[PDB]
Structures are given as structure tokens and as C-alpha cells.
């Protein structure tokens, strides 16, 4: 149950943050298509 979390890649998922931090943060930019 735990090993399959990382083996399938489900663990490697970004975590959402509130929009205020994103606006203040400069490193975060729209990913290209």
C-alpha cells in the first residue's frame, strides 16, 4: 500500500499553495505546452 504509492509515481505530485504566495513568488512560472 505504501511502496506502490511511490512505485507508481503518485507520491511525486506537486502540492497546491494559496494564490497570494504564488503571486509573490517569482520562481513559479507557467509551464510550456
Amino acid at each position: 500500500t505504501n511502496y506502490a504509492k511511490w512505485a507508481t509515481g503518485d507520491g511525486l505530485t506537486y502540492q497546491k499553495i494559496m494564490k497570494e504566495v504564488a503571486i509573490d513568488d517569482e520562481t513559479m512560472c507557467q509551464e510550456e505546452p
Partner: peptide, 16 residues
């Protein structure tokens, strides 16, 4: 809205 992410920090955020 759009989506902006930081790959180095592994973060994402939705801009309305």
C-alpha cells in the same frame, strides 16, 4: 484561470 508551477520547489498554484 491558468496554472503556474515551480519545478525546483515542486509547487503549483492556480491563478484565477
Amino acid at each position: 484561470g491558468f496554472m503556474i508551477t515551480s519545478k525546483t520547489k515542486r509547487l503549483k498554484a492556480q491563478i484565477p
